[PDB]
Design a protein around this ligand. Structure first.
Ligand code: ER6
Ligand code: ER6
Ligand code: ZN
Ligand code: ZN
Lengths: 352, 353
């Protein structure tokens, strides 16, 4: 059936912003490189570095040309984790043995003291850029840089641990039938990350698991075939389906911006649902470009099924339901369901 | 005739337990050496490389003999020797190894002597172990450890360089159609290694030779176009079994004819290099179906014979370096191996009986 041409028109429109996203990224890289070189001089942040994560390095940044999000990794001594209240994603951080001694509150690493020093040094080194404290986000992102005219950068601190992944991830990352058990094992040997994030008042000394570096690797190396999307015979529509899924939600959220019905929904929900769609459809032949219309339709349908059943487990932490009623109320999911179904039934007028 | 090739593969597995037990004994001795070496200021950054046929799962000979590479992280400047493409003098830009300098170049002889002396002193404190200075191998391997009753291990020292690969590698590693250009670029961001190896003029004694054994392992242990190659019944291929059979056939021919020197210069590295070229020429997993093992091995043998007849076998990473040059292997050797392999193939490999 006709319709995919409208999806292609949207993908063409998104490509027009590539050069403006590239020139603003080059300015961000300049400020960020200078920030890190000054941060490494502090004894607590000597092991600081740049994590090459986010939609920009995944080549799926499809809105906000002057809004970037960057992660600063910090290598830590051997970390011991203590799960917080069976949340499977939030942990207290302890140490087996230390430059971060000043930030201990008892025996746990205080996220409050780490953010305070992080925000203080950044404000001191920024002193054509200004700094803004990022509030109402639980600590991640911590700050927002304002660079030159209208460029903003959200900066997130992330502890790096080279230890085995926590037990709560043992059944996650179900890529064996898609990218192979060998790749799974190699991914699980990479470090994992922890960002400061309070858990709901709130417990303010918790850290949350982050696998943004794994998400980027899978997105940029997404086929069963190693030569997927490298020649005309092996072009797939995986990345374009993710792009359109993120664009659909962003255009809907802009459409209903004044009311908070879609406030709790995030590009991470679409990203997580997409990874599960890839697990359920591991063969490259199921993602052929001539079926771009079909594939996007099945992606929308899968995300619709997640909202109706109120189930969307974290791809890495299967016991963590991103769609739990403690996080997103039923009426919000029903509202998003109705609007997406309307769009799908009318060839997506949001894309006009 | 493919059933006899399967019989060989079956009988090769009987030695897996003996290989594993000896490998564990080697590891314990090797770990004691690395701890002693890391105490010296010149070798503070020494580490184990984990390469060779054991870690590639294609070890087919000498269950009690192993090859081990100690890597040493070094910012070096390379100066190619006599346009050889593979042999280099090592200089430094802008130093823990300054005791091994002779003028501006890093001396392989001076570094090997200190390497041998530390290992020899750390071995005298380990029971049922002795060390031998390896001769006539040009410095690599440097020593041979004797362990317990019949275990021996060759130890090679290797400088690690995290800089860009040398220009002689620019058009090597032609895996784009097989393992993808994305993987090729990832492999080339890894370090390269240099082993001490004298060059024939070996008459020039301060050269180092490029080594990519870590890259050969990655390819062999991740060999399919499909990431799930050999991970399920639908995607079982015969690539590694073909390599094992090629290695076994050459080794068996060398041992059968060791009373003469006709085959002394041939090495398993020649078979492995030809195999990588076979993989480049046949990139699809479908061309390596396990039901066609007899045909696949026959085509591998055929390709190796063609290299022998044409006297052409480029180093897989350095395409201008011909391993089958007349400066390295006499035409008489190639002719004798050709005739022997042809006779074997014609009568269903009686060498395996
Ligand atoms: O990891 C991050 O911080 C990324 C940037 C912020 C958004 N995001 C999320 N990651 C989560 C990781 C574990 C549990 C819940 C998560 N979650 C719930 C809503 C949004 C997220 C992705
Ligand atoms: O590199 C080593 O030392 C490995 C262990 C010894 C065997 N070998 C060879 N590598 C070479 C690398 C560049 C040029 C010629 C090479 N060559 C010629 C005959 C055998 C080799 C592999
Ligand atoms: Zn693709
Ligand atoms: Zn295979």
């Amino acid at each position: 059936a006709p319709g995919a041409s409208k999806l292609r028109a949207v993908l063409e429109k998104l490509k027009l912003s590539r050069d403006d996203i590239s020139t603003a990224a080059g300015m961000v890289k300049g400020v960020v490189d200078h920030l890190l070189l000054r941060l490494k001089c502090d004894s607590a942040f000597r092991g600081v570095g740049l994590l090459n994560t986010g939609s920009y390095y995944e080549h799926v940044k499809i809105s906000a040309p002057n809004e970037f999000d960057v992660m600063f990794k910090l290598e830590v001594p051997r970390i011991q984790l203590e799960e917080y209240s069976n949340t499977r994603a939030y942990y207290f951080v302890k140490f087996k043995r230390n430059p971060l001694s000043q930030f201990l509150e008892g025996e746990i690493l205080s996220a409050s003291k780490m953010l305070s020093k992080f925000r203080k040094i950044i404000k001191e080194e920024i002193n054509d850029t200004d700094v803004i404290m990022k509030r109402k986000r639980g600590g991640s992102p911590a700050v927002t840089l304002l660079i030159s005219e209208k460029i903003s950068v959200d900066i997130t601190l992330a502890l790096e641990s080279k230890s085995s992944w926590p037990a709560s991830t043992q059944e996650g990352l179900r890529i064996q039938n898609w990218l192979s058990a060998k790749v799974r094992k190699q991914l699980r040997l990479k470090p994992f990350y922890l960002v400061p994030k309070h858990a709901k008042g709130f417990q303010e000394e918790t850290w949350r698991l982050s696998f943004s570096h794994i998400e980027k690797e899978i997105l940029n190396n997404h086929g069963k075939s190693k030569t997927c999307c490298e020649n005309k015979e092996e072009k797939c529509c995986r990345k374009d389906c993710l792009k359109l899924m993120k664009y659909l939600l962003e255009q809907l959220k802009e459409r209903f911006k004044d009311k908070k019905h879609l406030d709790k929904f995030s590009s991470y929900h679409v990203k997580t649902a997409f990874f599960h769609v890839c697990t359920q459809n591991p063969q490259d032949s199921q993602w052929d470009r001539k079926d771009l219309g079909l594939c996007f339709d099945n992606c929308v349908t899968y995300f619709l099924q997640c909202l109706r059943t109120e189930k969307l487990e974290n791809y890495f932490i299967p016991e963590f339901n991103l769609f739990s009623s403690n996080l997103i109320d039923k009426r919000s999911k029903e509202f998003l369901t109705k609007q997406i179904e309307y769009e799908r039934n009318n060839e997506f007028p949001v894309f006009d």
